[PDB]
Structures are given as C-alpha cells and as structure tokens.
Design a protein around this motif. Sequence first.
Motif, PDB file in Angstrom:
ATOM      1  N   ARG A 252       0.862  -1.205   0.000  1.00  0.00           N
ATOM      2  CA  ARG A 252       0.000   0.000   0.000  1.00  0.00           C
ATOM      3  C   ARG A 252       0.889   1.243   0.000  1.00  0.00           C
ATOM      4  O   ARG A 252       2.114   1.106   0.212  1.00  0.00           O
ATOM      5  CB  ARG A 252      -0.955  -0.016   1.198  1.00  0.00           C
ATOM      6  CG  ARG A 252      -0.277   0.084   2.558  1.00  0.00           C
ATOM      7  CD  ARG A 252      -1.329   0.358   3.613  1.00  0.00           C
ATOM      8  NE  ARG A 252      -0.865   0.366   4.991  1.00  0.00           N
ATOM      9  CZ  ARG A 252      -0.353   1.421   5.623  1.00  0.00           C
ATOM     10  NH1 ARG A 252      -0.175   2.571   4.996  1.00  0.00           N
ATOM     11  NH2 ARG A 252      -0.007   1.317   6.890  1.00  0.00           N
TER      12      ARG A 252
ATOM     13  N   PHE B  41       1.752   0.561  20.778  1.00  0.00           N
ATOM     14  CA  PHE B  41       0.985  -0.483  21.510  1.00  0.00           C
ATOM     15  C   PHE B  41       1.873  -1.186  22.544  1.00  0.00           C
ATOM     16  O   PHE B  41       1.544  -2.316  22.937  1.00  0.00           O
ATOM     17  CB  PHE B  41       0.365  -1.465  20.515  1.00  0.00           C
ATOM     18  CG  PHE B  41      -0.371  -0.811  19.374  1.00  0.00           C
ATOM     19  CD1 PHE B  41      -1.476  -0.005  19.608  1.00  0.00           C
ATOM     20  CD2 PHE B  41       0.034  -1.000  18.063  1.00  0.00           C
ATOM     21  CE1 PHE B  41      -2.152   0.594  18.556  1.00  0.00           C
ATOM     22  CE2 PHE B  41      -0.642  -0.398  17.011  1.00  0.00           C
ATOM     23  CZ  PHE B  41      -1.738   0.395  17.259  1.00  0.00           C
TER      24      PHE B  41
ATOM     25  N   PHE C  48       4.175  -7.039  14.118  1.00  0.00           N
ATOM     26  CA  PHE C  48       3.957  -7.732  12.828  1.00  0.00           C
ATOM     27  C   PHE C  48       2.907  -6.955  12.033  1.00  0.00           C
ATOM     28  O   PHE C  48       2.059  -6.276  12.643  1.00  0.00           O
ATOM     29  CB  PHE C  48       3.544  -9.182  13.076  1.00  0.00           C
ATOM     30  CG  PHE C  48       4.575 -10.014  13.790  1.00  0.00           C
ATOM     31  CD1 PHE C  48       4.654 -10.012  15.170  1.00  0.00           C
ATOM     32  CD2 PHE C  48       5.449 -10.823  13.080  1.00  0.00           C
ATOM     33  CE1 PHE C  48       5.618 -10.757  15.828  1.00  0.00           C
ATOM     34  CE2 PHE C  48       6.396 -11.596  13.740  1.00  0.00           C
ATOM     35  CZ  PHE C  48       6.470 -11.573  15.111  1.00  0.00           C
TER      36      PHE C  48
ATOM     37  N   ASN D 154       0.290  -5.690   6.043  1.00  0.00           N
ATOM     38  CA  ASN D 154       0.908  -5.018   4.868  1.00  0.00           C
ATOM     39  C   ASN D 154       2.410  -5.321   4.841  1.00  0.00           C
ATOM     40  O   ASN D 154       3.126  -4.835   5.724  1.00  0.00           O
ATOM     41  CB  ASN D 154       0.712  -3.503   4.878  1.00  0.00           C
ATOM     42  CG  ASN D 154      -0.711  -3.065   4.609  1.00  0.00           C
ATOM     43  OD1 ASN D 154      -1.336  -2.441   5.462  1.00  0.00           O
ATOM     44  ND2 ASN D 154      -1.219  -3.378   3.428  1.00  0.00           N
TER      45      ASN D 154
ATOM     46  N   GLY E 178      -3.597  -3.530  16.489  1.00  0.00           N
ATOM     47  CA  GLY E 178      -3.704  -2.117  16.094  1.00  0.00           C
ATOM     48  C   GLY E 178      -4.623  -1.990  14.902  1.00  0.00           C
ATOM     49  O   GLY E 178      -4.168  -2.317  13.784  1.00  0.00           O
ATOM     50  N   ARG E 179      -5.878  -1.593  15.132  1.00  0.00           N
ATOM     51  CA  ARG E 179      -6.902  -1.444  14.064  1.00  0.00           C
ATOM     52  C   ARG E 179      -6.677  -0.142  13.306  1.00  0.00           C
ATOM     53  O   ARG E 179      -6.694   0.937  13.895  1.00  0.00           O
ATOM     54  CB  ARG E 179      -8.324  -1.398  14.622  1.00  0.00           C
ATOM     55  CG  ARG E 179      -8.939  -2.758  14.898  1.00  0.00           C
ATOM     56  CD  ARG E 179     -10.408  -2.566  15.220  1.00  0.00           C
ATOM     57  NE  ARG E 179     -11.269  -2.560  14.050  1.00  0.00           N
ATOM     58  CZ  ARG E 179     -11.647  -3.647  13.375  1.00  0.00           C
ATOM     59  NH1 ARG E 179     -11.213  -4.846  13.733  1.00  0.00           N
ATOM     60  NH2 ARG E 179     -12.456  -3.525  12.335  1.00  0.00           N
TER      61      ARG E 179
ATOM     62  N   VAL F 161      -8.535   5.839  10.457  1.00  0.00           N
ATOM     63  CA  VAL F 161      -8.326   7.072   9.638  1.00  0.00           C
ATOM     64  C   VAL F 161      -8.022   6.646   8.193  1.00  0.00           C
ATOM     65  O   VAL F 161      -8.844   6.954   7.293  1.00  0.00           O
ATOM     66  CB  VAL F 161      -7.207   7.956  10.232  1.00  0.00           C
ATOM     67  CG1 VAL F 161      -6.818   9.101   9.307  1.00  0.00           C
ATOM     68  CG2 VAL F 161      -7.580   8.487  11.611  1.00  0.00           C
ATOM     69  N   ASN F 162      -6.896   5.947   7.992  1.00  0.00           N
ATOM     70  CA  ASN F 162      -6.466   5.403   6.674  1.00  0.00           C
ATOM     71  C   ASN F 162      -7.314   4.163   6.361  1.00  0.00           C
ATOM     72  O   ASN F 162      -6.992   3.052   6.875  1.00  0.00           O
ATOM     73  CB  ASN F 162      -4.963   5.105   6.624  1.00  0.00           C
ATOM     74  CG  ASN F 162      -4.458   4.797   5.226  1.00  0.00           C
ATOM     75  OD1 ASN F 162      -5.241   4.626   4.290  1.00  0.00           O
ATOM     76  ND2 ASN F 162      -3.146   4.723   5.072  1.00  0.00           N
TER      77      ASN F 162
ATOM     78  N   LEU G 283      -7.361   2.384   3.847  1.00  0.00           N
ATOM     79  CA  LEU G 283      -6.656   1.365   3.019  1.00  0.00           C
ATOM     80  C   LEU G 283      -5.648   0.554   3.850  1.00  0.00           C
ATOM     81  O   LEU G 283      -5.222  -0.513   3.356  1.00  0.00           O
ATOM     82  CB  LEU G 283      -5.974   2.052   1.832  1.00  0.00           C
ATOM     83  CG  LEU G 283      -6.916   2.664   0.790  1.00  0.00           C
ATOM     84  CD1 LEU G 283      -6.163   3.001  -0.492  1.00  0.00           C
ATOM     85  CD2 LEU G 283      -8.084   1.740   0.484  1.00  0.00           C
ATOM     86  N   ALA G 284      -5.280   1.006   5.052  1.00  0.00           N
ATOM     87  CA  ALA G 284      -4.268   0.328   5.904  1.00  0.00           C
ATOM     88  C   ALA G 284      -4.838  -0.989   6.439  1.00  0.00           C
ATOM     89  O   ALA G 284      -6.034  -1.030   6.794  1.00  0.00           O
ATOM     90  CB  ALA G 284      -3.818   1.220   7.033  1.00  0.00           C
ATOM     91  N   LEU G 285      -4.011  -2.035   6.481  1.00  0.00           N
ATOM     92  CA  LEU G 285      -4.349  -3.307   7.164  1.00  0.00           C
ATOM     93  C   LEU G 285      -3.838  -3.244   8.607  1.00  0.00           C
ATOM     94  O   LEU G 285      -3.120  -2.291   8.961  1.00  0.00           O
ATOM     95  CB  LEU G 285      -3.760  -4.489   6.386  1.00  0.00           C
ATOM     96  CG  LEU G 285      -4.200  -4.605   4.925  1.00  0.00           C
ATOM     97  CD1 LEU G 285      -3.528  -5.793   4.256  1.00  0.00           C
ATOM     98  CD2 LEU G 285      -5.714  -4.708   4.801  1.00  0.00           C
ATOM     99  N   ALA G 286      -4.217  -4.230   9.414  1.00  0.00           N
ATOM    100  CA  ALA G 286      -3.935  -4.298  10.860  1.00  0.00           C
ATOM    101  C   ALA G 286      -2.440  -4.525  11.105  1.00  0.00           C
ATOM    102  O   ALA G 286      -1.759  -5.131  10.253  1.00  0.00           O
ATOM    103  CB  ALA G 286      -4.764  -5.400  11.484  1.00  0.00           C
ATOM    104  N   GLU G 287      -1.973  -4.035  12.249  1.00  0.00           N
ATOM    105  CA  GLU G 287      -0.670  -4.363  12.871  1.00  0.00           C
ATOM    106  C   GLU G 287      -0.958  -5.115  14.172  1.00  0.00           C
ATOM    107  O   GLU G 287      -2.045  -4.917  14.765  1.00  0.00           O
ATOM    108  CB  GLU G 287       0.138  -3.079  13.075  1.00  0.00           C
ATOM    109  CG  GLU G 287       0.493  -2.403  11.760  1.00  0.00           C
ATOM    110  CD  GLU G 287       0.564  -0.888  11.786  1.00  0.00           C
ATOM    111  OE1 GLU G 287       0.605  -0.315  12.891  1.00  0.00           O
ATOM    112  OE2 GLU G 287       0.581  -0.286  10.688  1.00  0.00           O
TER     113      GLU G 287
END
Lengths: 162, 46
Positions: free
Chosen positions: A28, A106, A112, A115, B13-14, B16-17, B19-23
């Motif tokens: 992305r 966090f 991890f 993306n 970490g869910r 704003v963006n 298009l971002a996927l989770a961390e």
Amino acid sequence: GSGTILIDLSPDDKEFQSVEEEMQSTVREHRDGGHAGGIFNRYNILKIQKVCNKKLWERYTHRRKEVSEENHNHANERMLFHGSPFVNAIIHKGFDERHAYIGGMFGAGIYFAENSSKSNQYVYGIGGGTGCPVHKDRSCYICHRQLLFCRVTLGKSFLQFS
Amino acid sequence: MAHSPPGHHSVTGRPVNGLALAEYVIYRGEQAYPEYLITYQIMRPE
Ligand SMILES: COc1ccc2c(=O)[nH]c3sccc3c2c1
Ligand SMILES: [Zn+2]
C-alpha cells in the motif's frame, strides 16, 4: 550449530507462488510518502527460503497449545510480515525481548504487519534508519532486502482503535 | 518487554487510513515462528 537450515523454494512451487502473492498483494501507499520504506508499488522477489529449525518450531507449538487451551482451543494463528535489521539473529535463535519495539504505540512488544510494505519500513531500522548500509538510501532500488513471513499466535487479542 | 493486557495474548492495532491493514503485537517471542525468509528489491515505479 543453530540447527537452522534454509530450503530454497522453486518459483514453480505453489508454496513460492502463494508467499509471493501475499508479499505483492499487501503493498500500500504510506502516509510518509515513502520516507521510511521507499517509493514503490511492487517488489522484485529474488528468493523465498523455508526456515527449518526443530527446536524453534517445538518452542512455537508448545506456546501455541498453551494459548489455545486458554482460548477455547483457538490459537487465532495468522501469517504476518516482520522487517528487521536482526532477521539473521531471528532465523537462528528465534524472536525474544531483543526484537521488541520499545517505543511502539501499543507497548514494548514484537510487531507484525498484514501489509508487507509496513514491515518494509523496518528492514533498515525504526523509520528506515539511515537506509541501505551501502548507499544510505531508504528508497534504494539496488540493495537486496529481506522480510520474514511468520506464523503468529494471537490468541485473545486486545483491539486498539487508531 | 511489556506484558499483554490482562486476559489477552496480543494487541491488534486497528487501522483514519481506510486502506491500511492491521498491525499486531505479541509480548512472548515463542508466539511467532519465522516460516519464510523473502529476499527482494523494491521496484522504481515506471
Ligand atoms: C508499528 O507497526 C509495525 C509494523 C511492522 C513492524 C515490523 O515488521 N518490524 C518492526 S521492527 C520494530 C518495529 C516493527 C514494526 C512495527
Ligand atoms: Zn543501497
């Protein structure tokens, strides 16, 4: 004598192809316009190796069963990317406190990403550090980079909104 | 290394963006196994 061997996957192997597709399809755009990880829409995959270590695998499956038994027989296991300057230490000796992101939003844990492009920001250090060791370029298109594609036990995960 | 939130094994970490996927964060090295080592270059957009 770490006990780690690396097995090269053929590009013709379904396992090579599914790992490449997860790498390419989870790129992305980043809010830093490429500052940390560089400017790119896709990768040139040079090699995919299976990481084989009996001790480190048994260490993983032992902890996975502990988590599973604490969470109605559900490990909540994911395949996730990890970028680090310490990938060589990780594949030989495993993840530990030394691979933790002390300043992470966090808390001081091991991070991890879904993306691949997020993990790519950490290959040369926090925020891409000073970039590639040869050219000091966070957007180097020449230097070979490495990511780990990792089996991760989440168990019961605390949902943090951002 | 910190502890997981009490009663939890990890943090999500869910994104704003939109298009971002989770961390994700684990607080035990034993909760991850490095299955694949991927060697690559980022490609300059055309
Ligand atoms: C904040 O989100 C992330 C997401 C992915 C990663 C990652 O792959 N490797 C490292 S090494 C230190 C921090 C991180 C990190 C942090
Ligand atoms: Zn370079």
